Design a protein around this ligand. Structure first.
Ligand SMILES: CC(=O)N[C@@H]1[C@@H](O)[C@H](O)[C@@H](CO)O[C@H]1O
Ligand SMILES: CC(=O)N[C@@H]1[C@@H](O)[C@H](O)[C@@H](CO)O[C@H]1O
Ligand SMILES: CC(=O)N[C@@H]1[C@@H](O)[C@H](O)[C@@H](CO)O[C@H]1O
Ligand SMILES: CC(=O)N[C@@H]1[C@@H](O)[C@H](O)[C@@H](CO)O[C@H]1O
Lengths: 288, 288
């Protein structure tokens, strides 16, 4: 009877299916081959990218904002992170995959991958932060999981109300609505490929009282917004049960701004508990 | 806002991660490329295969028996399925991966894949049944998941006490013992590749009182021996809580023989409830 102190390494054909698990050689990492080809012409993808007061090919300190389902970049962020990030010193940039993020999430991801490639080079080959809302976080993690080239181009991910496990809340529906339904082939694929473990330093801010994305009530790995090794911030864990911000409030509240600002400036790439407390448990809009 | 009645198909790079899920084109099937290469010389794999009273290259109605952890084919089946299958008209054949199924489960699987290739051709290019105990079922499902060529060569799988999710019951250990521990990279890979859904008609007979493989108490998908679309037979569901066969009894009891005989002769490839009832809830050895 032979014996050893580690689990045998998986053969090549099987490792893509155990990302994050530890074998004798160490933790199994994500596959790192070439990027899958885009189904959309690059000119079509470029048309979906915009930066405020600048061209994405020559921009200073860009921050890429990825919108939520049923919205464009301006609709999601005009009243909040476009002006808030500008005030923090970034050039706000965003993608608006047509039509209103309702089409195939895999195509919406092409817009994000192309945007990161563009903004990385456009900012002098420097990593940039990605900030998202709702489906935008699912798109970010899908891109990081399946497009190896951008993993070294994103320095951190600040995701508000991300639905990595989709939602159980919910007939003929938009393509991306089918994909964000819990149990969907898309959410199944993300999990099975190792996507529920962070790839870049990630902060997920969400709320137990989200009326769009559930379940989010456990403050644990069962929550749709949770990523292993990430800085998972369920608002009620910090603020108590009387703090009841909704799906959009998760993006726009003063609490959300304090946590996001912490994540954006942190040298670890993740928000820090030392940067927020009970006094920041403010449900009013940050931009107000 | 566009709308449709199905979830968009996954792009090629992602479908291997959603086997079994339904998209517009239908249910996502397992990848079907070439078989991964063997790490062991074929002559070494052949040395692990034996048939009773015949050569595996020229055999009549073979049945391939895959043993449990810490045993050889004869140790697992001499007192039970070797003589029981012979009495049913098959030529019993078995593999004995060295040493006693304690080495890498991926290598133990090479012995099974090679054996099926050999016995299929050796029996006149006819499909054959595979009957297993313990790790043998994990090996069978691992082979069917990752070696496409044998999917059309196995007509059915009759697995006794299979540990597809490994076991939670359990220091320096044998390679395959690490792999069968719940949470292992190997069991994670099987699940993520779609392996917890049957590939060929499968019957899983197991017991809530298995002292080696747990959990097995729910008579549901949470059980380690459960496969979606399979004929999952938890003994106590049929026989009640006073029926307490153990890990080996799951293989050798009269109840187990009645269910196995049903699976082997069934035109559906799975055991049939109409073939067993309370009278067959006999914990005594079938071969006795
Ligand atoms: C605005 C837009 O891109 N419309 C697309 C259409 O071109 C495409 O045929 C269909 C599925 O590919 O999804 C629609 O939403
Ligand atoms: C289904 C499940 O196990 N998750 C529960 C959730 O239902 C419950 O509301 C929450 C309370 O904080 O605790 C989680 O562990
Ligand atoms: C009987 C046998 O095959 N022994 C093998 C040995 O050859 C191999 O070096 C090691 C890991 O590959 O696993 C052992 O169990
Ligand atoms: C952990 C879990 O949810 N599984 C339970 C199991 O613990 C329980 O013993 C069994 C009773 O039959 O029912 C299952 O659903």
């Amino acid at each position: 009877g032979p014996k050893q102190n580690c689990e045998p390494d998986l053969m090549p054909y099987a490792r893509p299916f155990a990302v994050g698990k530890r074998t004798c050689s160490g933790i199994v990492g994500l596959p790192s081959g070439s990027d899958p080809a885009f189904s959309q012409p690059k000119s079509v993808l470029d048309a979906g990218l915009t930066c405020q007061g600048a061209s994405p090919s020559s921009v200073s300190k860009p921050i890429l904002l990825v919108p939520g389902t049923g919205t464009t970049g301006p609709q999601s962020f005009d009243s909040n992170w476009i002006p808030l990030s500008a005030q923090l010193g970034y050039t706000p940039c965003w993608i608006s995959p047509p039509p209103f993020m309702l089409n195939d999430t895999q195509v919406n991801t092409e817009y994000m991958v192309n945007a990161i490639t563009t903004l990385y080079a456009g900012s002098g080959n420097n990593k940039l932060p990605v900030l998202t809302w709702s489906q935008g976080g699912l798109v970010a993690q899908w891109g990081l999981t399946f497009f190896p080239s951008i993993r070294s181009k994103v320095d951190r991910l600040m995701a508000f109300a991300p639905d990595y496990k989709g939602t159980v809340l919910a007939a003929v529906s938009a393509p991306s609505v089918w994909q964000q339904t819990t149990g969907s082939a898309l959410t199944t694929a993300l999990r099975n490929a190792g996507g529920l473990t962070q790839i870049v330093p990630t902060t997920n801010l969400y709320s137990a009282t989200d009326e769009i994305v559930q379940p989010q009530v456990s403050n644990s790995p069962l929550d749709s917004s949770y990523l292993f090794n990430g800085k998972n911030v369920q608002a009620q864990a910090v603020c108590g049960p009387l703090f009841v911000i909704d799906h959009a409030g998760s993006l726009t509240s003063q609490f959300s701004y304090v946590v996001g600002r912490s994540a954006l400036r942190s040298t670890t790439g993740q928000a820090r508990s030392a940067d927020y407390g009970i006094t920041d448990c403010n449900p009013l809009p940050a931009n107000d």
